[PDB]
């Protein structure tokens, strides 16, 4: 059996075909087992509509999960993504660093 | 003006909803200007059908490009992706490392 904590990255992207729209991304990579929970947070509150969840694996024991949704951040809203996994005794909250 | 060479990563992923299919990915990140050329290679030859090309930007001067397509690699085929950019005097060829 192998267990590996997700590496977590939080970043925004504008699709080039629709540069006005903006997407908050939480990327979890290299984790096992594949059981996971993830929420995007806006000022500590769960964002209930998350349009996109893309799960994949490379080796049979390495999962990758992209969880993202359109947002419109203001300079005073705090965004983050909260991840639970068996390798994490407490939920892990990673803040969006605007730059990256 | 800012110019930045792409960081290039080549990796495979299986979508979890269709675990049998396999995708070769070439990910170029953080580059500027956005003008770029990229091919996936199989034993040195360009792969002409590349189903997916996802371009985005974060800051106005930082582009991200995911270029990928379904493949069926054998243990003796060599895969790579070849990138041209103004910051690269010669085309850059990054080989697929199966593991990653
Ligand atoms: Ca990615
Ligand atoms: Mg836990
Ligand atoms: Mg060049």
Swiss-Prot record, chains A, B:
Keywords annotated in UniProt: Amyloid, Amyloidosis, Disease variant, Disulfide bond, Glycation, Glycoprotein, Immunity, Immunoglobulin domain, MHC I, Pyrrolidone carboxylic acid, Secreted, Signal
Domain Ig-like C1-type intervals: 6-94
The record's account of how the chain is modified after translation: Glycation of Ile-2 is observed in long-term hemodialysis patients.
Effect of residue 61 to V: Increases tendency towards amyloid formation
Glycosylated position list: 2, 20, 42, 49, 59, 92, 95
Disulfide bonds: 26-81
GO cellular component, one term: focal adhesion
Protein name per Swiss-Prot or TrEMBL: Beta-2-microglobulin
Gene name per UniProt: B2M
């Amino acid at each position: 059996m192998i267990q590996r904590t997700p590496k977590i990255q939080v970043y925004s992207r504008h699709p080039a075909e629709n540069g006005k729209s903006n997407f908050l991304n939480c990327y979890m990579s290299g984790f096992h087992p594949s059981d996971i929970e993830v929420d995007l947070l806006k000022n500590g509150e769960r964002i209930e509509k998350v349009e996109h969840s893309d799960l994949s694996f490379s080796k049979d024991w390495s999962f990758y999960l992209l969880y993202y949704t359109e947002f419109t951040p203001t300079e005073k809203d705090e965004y983050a993504c909260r991840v639970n996994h068996v390798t994490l005794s407490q939920p892990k909250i990673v803040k969006w660093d605007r730059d990256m």
